[PDB]
Amino acid sequence: QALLRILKETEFKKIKVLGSGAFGTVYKGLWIPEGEKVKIPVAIKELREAKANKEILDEAYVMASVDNPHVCRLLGICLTSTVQLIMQLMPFGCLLDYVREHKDNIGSQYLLNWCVQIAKGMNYLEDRRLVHRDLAARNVLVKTPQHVKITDFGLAKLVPIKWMALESILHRIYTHQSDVWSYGVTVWELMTFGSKPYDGIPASEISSILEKGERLPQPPICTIDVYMIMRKCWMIDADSRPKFRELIIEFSKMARDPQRYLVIQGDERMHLPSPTDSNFYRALMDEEDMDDVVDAD
Amino acid sequence: ALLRILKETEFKKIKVLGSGAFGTVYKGLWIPEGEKVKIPVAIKELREATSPKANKEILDEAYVMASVDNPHVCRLLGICLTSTVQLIMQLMPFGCLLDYVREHKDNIGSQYLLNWCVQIAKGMNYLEDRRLVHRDLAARNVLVKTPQHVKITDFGLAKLLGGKVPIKWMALESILHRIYTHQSDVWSYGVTVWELMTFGSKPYDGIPASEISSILEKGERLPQPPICTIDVYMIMRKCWMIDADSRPKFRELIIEFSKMARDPQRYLVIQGDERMHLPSPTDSNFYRALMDEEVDA
Numbered sequence: 106q107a108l109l110r111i112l113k114e115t116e117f118k119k120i121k122v123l124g125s126g127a128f129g130t131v132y133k134g135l136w137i138p139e140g141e142k143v144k145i146p147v148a149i150k151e152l153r154e155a156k157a158n159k160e161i162l163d164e165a166y167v168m169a170s171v172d173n174p175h176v177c178r179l180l181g182i183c184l185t186s187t188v189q190l191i192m193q194l195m196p197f198g199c200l201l202d203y204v205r206e207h208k209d210n211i212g213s214q215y216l217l218n219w220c221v222q223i224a225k226g227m228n229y230l231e232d233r234r235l236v237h238r239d240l241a242a243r244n245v246l247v248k249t250p251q252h253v254k255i256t257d258f259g260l261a262k263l264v265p266i267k268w269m270a271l272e273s274i275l276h277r278i279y280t281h282q283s284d285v286w287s288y289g290v291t292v293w294e295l296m297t298f299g300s301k302p303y304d305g306i307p308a309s310e311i312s313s314i315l316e317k318g319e320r321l322p323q324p325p326i327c328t329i330d331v332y333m334i335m336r337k338c339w340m341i342d343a344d345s346r347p348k349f350r351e352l353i354i355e356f357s358k359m360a361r362d363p364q365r366y367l368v369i370q371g372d373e374r375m376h377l378p379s380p381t382d383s384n385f386y387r388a389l390m391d392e393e394d395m396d397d398v399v400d401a402d
Numbered sequence: 403a404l405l406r407i408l409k410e411t412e413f414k415k416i417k418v419l420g421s422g423a424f425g426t427v428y429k430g431l432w433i434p435e436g437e438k439v440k441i442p443v444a445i446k447e448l449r450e451a452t453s454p455k456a457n458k459e460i461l462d463e464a465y466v467m468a469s470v471d472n473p474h475v476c477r478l479l480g481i482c483l484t485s486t487v488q489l490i491m492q493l494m495p496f497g498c499l500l501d502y503v504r505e506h507k508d509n510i511g512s513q514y515l516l517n518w519c520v521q522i523a524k525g526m527n528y529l530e531d532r533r534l535v536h537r538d539l540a541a542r543n544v545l546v547k548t549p550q551h552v553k554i555t556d557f558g559l560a561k562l563l564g565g566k567v568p569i570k571w572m573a574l575e576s577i578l579h580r581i582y583t584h585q586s587d588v589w590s591y592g593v594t595v596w597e598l599m600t601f602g603s604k605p606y607d608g609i610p611a612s613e614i615s616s617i618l619e620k621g622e623r624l625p626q627p628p629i630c631t632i633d634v635y636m637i638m639r640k641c642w643m644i645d646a647d648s649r650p651k652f653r654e655l656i657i658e659f660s661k662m663a664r665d666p667q668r669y670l671v672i673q674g675d676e677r678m679h680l681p682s683p684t685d686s687n688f689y690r691a692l693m694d695e696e697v698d699a
């Protein structure tokens with residue numbers, strides 16, 4: 106209970122629109138502590154579609170309860186006719202827009218370290234018996250280039266076909282195994298530098314082509330071993346899909362020799378930050394706990 | 403790897419925050435190369451040291467400031483040896499403790515005052531273990547990270563550079579003989595506590611500094627703060643003793659102020675004190691998540 110703070114409307118203000126999605130509008134905001142004169146920047150998500158507040162609050166307590174360096178915690182809530190969710194502000198934005206804007210300068214060690222971190226987050230959520238149901242590059246937030254976090258779980262509970270497991274499309278079944286499917290699509294988005302999955306295919310026909318065996322194609326930089334994993338994520342038989350613990354191991358092993366599983370021109374020019382740059386980044390933007398990025402042997 | 407060398411072209415000063423004996427502090431924005439983000443920083447541009455010091459020696463002294471690790475001391479994060487000396491530290495939106503206590507002159511509870519005395523002495527004890535003499539401890543040189551977490555800044559600047567001599571904070575032997583030690587810092591600590599317990603009064607108000615040495619040798623000191631039990635005031639008096647080695651040591655100051663904080667209303671007499679408690683568990687959880695990712699009654 107002590108992890109969710111109930112904000113009052115006068116305590117905070119919206120100052121800029123950061124974008125919008127299926128479930129609401131995200132704003133940059135400013136949190137005015139009562140009696141103080143400081144302006145603390147936040148991210149506010151205002152839901153869409155104004156006794157349901159008990160429901161909403163009880164899921165908000167679960168969202169506020171997640172303590173993992175690769176999943177964003179819900180910090181606070183304001184309950185007016187539109188529910189408002191307050192979270193930490195990530196000025197780098199989402200990983201989808203990050204990889205699109207850096208399509209010509211992202212090195213192999215970044216890409217592989219991101220999928221390790223996304224797996225760690227999803228593994229934590231699976232250990233909590235929590236199903237995300239909307240994993241995608243757009244829903245991974247860049248806190249620093251070296252540290253990314255999953256966002257927006259639980260929002261679906263209270264339609265992204267091209268990221269959905271087949272059984273989710275046909276039968277609205279969501280498990281940790283269908284999250285693994287969306288993880289595969291997420292990895293594919295990153296390895297393609299933000300391509301749209303199944304570009305040119307109507308979403309209404311995705312379940313037809315999936316049943317016939319068709320899958321997203323092999324990104325030009327992915328070796329065979331990396332494409333295998335992604336394909337193992339899209340198995341029809343969910344119980345045959347890898348588990349999140351397995352993906353951590355697999356992507357950490359590849360991150361220890363990144364230039365053997367990703368082939369990208371200029372890959373030499375693009376290693377992880379110096380110890381110096383990492384200390385500087387962390388002191389200004391990221392002082393929370395974290396397991397170190399896996400470096401090449 | 404703790405001190406980042408910054409290029410003039412990757413950070414720009416914005417609004418002047420204030421000026422003191424060592425230089426001018428700006429609010430600035432760090433812009434990492436290749437990125438689109440603006441990261442707020444504080445920049446202290448230094449006055450010309452009338453000690454004409456070599457660049458590399460400045461680097462060596464900056465490394466020591468960059469190598470302090472303690473929750474109640476501010477780290478030097480970056481430096482630029484431009485055409486001037488520019489120091490990059492984390493921006494504290496709450497500003498110095500002195501202005502904080504003045505603006506909240508009568509909503510500062512005993513729990514906050516005593517806890518602040520504890521934290522300041524911890525950071526000074528840390529400096530003493532590292533054999534670092536501050537020389538300019540004052541409430542203006544304690545920064546408020548959150549109201550519940552403060553930090554000592556500007557240590558070693560008086561060392562580095564050589565009006566601007568805070569005579570009213572100096573121990574007798576520093577005014578008389580230029581003797582700066584850790585026991586000399588304990589005197590300035592005592593004065594700092596006085597500033598706190600008076601809600602930011604100017605010490606020896608109305609007395610010129612040329613007279614300070616004279617009135618100390620006559621035996622008169624700062625007067626008992628209206629809120630201070632003799633228990634607290636006896637501590638302050640001990641800091642201002644003539645023999646430097648009879649003054650308290652910081653770790654004893656840590657112990658005694660921590661003992662008093664466990665029964666704060668027995669050591670400070672504040673009207674409406676029970677209404678000014680330390681934040682609820684939720685409120686600090688939220689404060690820390692947003693601002694501070696790094697003793698109760």
Ligand SMILES: Nc1ncnc2c1ncn2[C@@H]1O[C@H](COP(=O)(O)OP(=O)(O)NP(=O)(O)O)[C@@H](O)[C@H]1O
Pocket residue numbers: 123124125126127128129130131148192193194195196198199239243244246256257265
């Ligand atoms: N905490 C945050 N800080 C900064 N930007 C954020 C934050 N949360 C979300 N955003 C951005 O706000 C925009 C809208 O996010 P959102 O409303 O979740 O839509 P979406 O995630 O892109 N699509 P979806 O999540 O499937 O509904 C996106 O560009 C996100 O990158």
Ligand SMILES: Nc1ncnc2c1ncn2[C@@H]1O[C@H](COP(=O)(O)OP(=O)(O)NP(=O)(O)O)[C@@H](O)[C@H]1O
Pocket residue numbers: 419420421422423424425426427444491492493494495497498538540542543545555556568
């Ligand atoms: N990192 C920081 N973040 C925010 N405010 C700061 C920071 N550093 C300093 N300030 C504020 O800026 C003011 C001006 O800086 P400064 O030159 O140190 O003045 P001063 O501390 O009052 N005098 P001095 O005893 O020489 O240090 C300080 O009084 C602080 O309130």
Ligand SMILES: [Mg+2]
Pocket residue numbers: 126243244256257
């Ligand atoms: Mg989202």
Ligand SMILES: [Mg+2]
Pocket residue numbers: 422542543555556
């Ligand atoms: Mg100062």
